Amino acid sequence: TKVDEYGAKDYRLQMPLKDDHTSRPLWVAPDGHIFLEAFSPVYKYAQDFLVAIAEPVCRPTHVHEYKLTAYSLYAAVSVGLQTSDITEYLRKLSKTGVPDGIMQFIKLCTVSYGKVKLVLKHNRYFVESCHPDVIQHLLQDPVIRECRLRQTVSFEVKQEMIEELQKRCIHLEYPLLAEYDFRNDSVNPDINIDLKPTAVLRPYQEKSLRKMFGNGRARSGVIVLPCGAGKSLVGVTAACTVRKRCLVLGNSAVSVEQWKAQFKMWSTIDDSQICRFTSDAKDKPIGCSVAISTYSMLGHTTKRSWEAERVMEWLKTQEWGLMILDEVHTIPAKMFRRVLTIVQAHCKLGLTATLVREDDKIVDLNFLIGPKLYEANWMELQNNGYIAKVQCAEVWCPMSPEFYREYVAIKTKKRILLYTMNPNKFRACQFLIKFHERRNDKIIVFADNVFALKEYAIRLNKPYIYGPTSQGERMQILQNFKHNPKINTIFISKVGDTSFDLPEANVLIQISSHGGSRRQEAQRLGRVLRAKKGMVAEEYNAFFYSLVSQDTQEMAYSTKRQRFLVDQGYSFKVITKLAGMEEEDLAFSTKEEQQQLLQKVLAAT
Amino acid sequence: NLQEFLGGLSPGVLDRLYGHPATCLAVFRELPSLAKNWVMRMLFLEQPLPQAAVALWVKKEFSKAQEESTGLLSGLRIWHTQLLILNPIFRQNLRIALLGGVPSLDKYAEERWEVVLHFMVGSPSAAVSQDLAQLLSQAGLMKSTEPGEPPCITSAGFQFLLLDTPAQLWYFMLQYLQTAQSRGMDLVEILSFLFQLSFSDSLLNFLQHLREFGLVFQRKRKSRRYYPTRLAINQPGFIVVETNYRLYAYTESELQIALIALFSEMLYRFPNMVVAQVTRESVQQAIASGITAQQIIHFLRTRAHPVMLKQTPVLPPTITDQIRLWELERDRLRFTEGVLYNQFLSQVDFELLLAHARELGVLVFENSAKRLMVVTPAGHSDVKRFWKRQ
């Protein structure tokens, strides 16, 4: 609240300093921000505690940055950490005390939890509460009465209005409890699903699962883990532990196929007990319990087949022990979020690898599913070797003079097709691909503009893939990329980042970018995180290049796009010039070639 | 360096400066490798010796050391060819110099220099001294232009500010001496005191200025005896740099926070720590003020926390490269005053004018293909006179 002569807020008169400050490695700002030391001997203990009570926002190598909020404190109380159980240790760890504001915030957040519990039974959602005064003073607003369908006091609530009531309670200071007591539940018989000994659970996976299962009752929340880290394995383990009917929701056909494959590989459950509620292929969804479908499958708003109506009505009628939702970052979308209310589930676990978006709808996920349970430390995984180390880089390509002339001259938005296609970046990517090709490194080129992708691919006579590409040709190209030594590069369009199971690649070049999309950046980066059989963290075998054009809007998009990665800790090194480019022969070495490309770009319209 | 300072002097001032007490010893210590030995050798000789002996008294290997030492001491005029006997005055004084004839102080020096830097920056609370203010103003690192309003800080001021304490103080004293001659204070008398430290009206005023700078402290109500501080004769880092342009500095003295705020955006200030961000706005602000990326990198490196000393390089490459690129972008467009030529009837005349401009140094850039060139306004008069002369 107090501002120094500079931008920073002043806290000299706010909180004191502990005498044994050097012993205490923890800081506590009044706003809730906490700065932990990664060099302290008790760093691991501090990390566990701060991860339990707070969500990371920046975890560089030296000083980690956490911030706590109501949802994080609720998650701590869910794993059973009382207000004293957290605040006492926070004061002990803190080297400068705990401001009264944070003290009262912690007390209020912890006490305002568990008073209101939401439990669904016999397809009816009852708002139970041991304390009656909470309901007595909670029925002030008319929205509660109109929402409601027309000790331990409970009342049934309308299915459709659950989301609205949930978001209302969040700001009403009475969060709802979505814990599932699968251990004590006889209404829905347990499913015959077991985890085979073959599956191996990594320490971070076990920690995330423990945080989800803080007690005997499973907690509904979001666990953010890298795509290469085995989030599919974690989800399968969660379903197996729940031992009740599970409905996994993908985002595309490849996602549903991979989820079925993961279920069979890691769970002893029989093949016949798994169904694919997909229009292209139906495996008798009503016959068995464990189901895999997608958000468009359930939330579809327009006409439905008669068979799909029967399946949908069966799904609505039945109650699900677990509702796994992969790629939760798309949930707050209108149609996708309608699925949450369409289907009934005790705990709706959420898995993803890039929980970031521009529109401030990510906060809605906290109430749509639950608080962010776990968020794996990418740097720690890199050190442990679970994830391949990446030498993140941004190759700056100077724009050609004529291209810049038209780019600046026109105030329209042909620049997206212009600066994405310039001779300098073309030569840069050509040289980079040549260097890695002679180095036997697998290349996965990326480009949002299909026009630029096709032009680059034809000029380099490479197998470019994109949306309307036939499925058979897609599979043939991927198989050749994985097996044929003669080919070691594939030029994938935006479809690549959506969802796929692609072979591990040693480099990932990105000539163009869709825009300032942290989601797309992280999604594409996750491709090369696939750990090799015997690599090492320090070898930096994996590389990521995000080619950008200097003095262009692409620079703004790149800088705005690398925020999530730098927050994780990756250091994007800038490369002004590439050694050996002048000696190596490359296309567009003469003005005429650039002129023809420019004429084609102008004629693109 | 002190070698530069003494090299830039006349023989008449040199021999006088070679005072009996200390100068002959302080200038001796300056002698890097071999001149010391040669001085001791020809310290007891009253007969000059041929130059060939000195030339051949160093083996073929490492002869460049012999040449450089001889040139340096020829500049100092310690001897004369006399045809290489040393100066008789220096010989006698050196023979007289060779068998012939605190914890609170360092803190005081630190505090006094810190308050001086606080005044140097726009600190509302600082020590007031009109003589110190005017001295810094005429030192070339500050300009007021309005006695009523407090003086501001010039471009050179920021560069001086970001320098390390040793170099900062040494340059400050160099400017002190140069301005001492301008104000009329005898240079030799004040200079000899500095040498005597490492072992009149002008002396009292000079000692007052030194005590103001914090190098000395009488401690006895300005008595004749003085106890020089450590800085008179001539530490761990605290900043931690992340990979996301974030600085966590364990600073309690406001001076360090101000120095960091000169090129970073401050976010939080804890009792024993402060958080700042190195953004384009702050870095380009400093570069516009006059700083260059080298000073910022050096400052962050020297004030480097021990935690990041283990990693090599100490400063992350991304941070260093980003700072350098940010400074470069500012001077992408290089401005240079000049005068253009047009309508060259013949290339022979243009080439002759180009040769003349090259000889005089007037030319700044030339274009043979377009038959044109650019000349600075200073050389515009010269080239115009040449054209008039035809």
Partner: peptide, 15 residues
């Protein structure tokens, strides 16, 4: 063998 490229090993900025 399998050594990192020059432009990633060391800063390519002119400084």
């Amino acid at each position: 063998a399998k050594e990192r490229p020059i432009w990633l090993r060391e800063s390519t900025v002119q400084g």
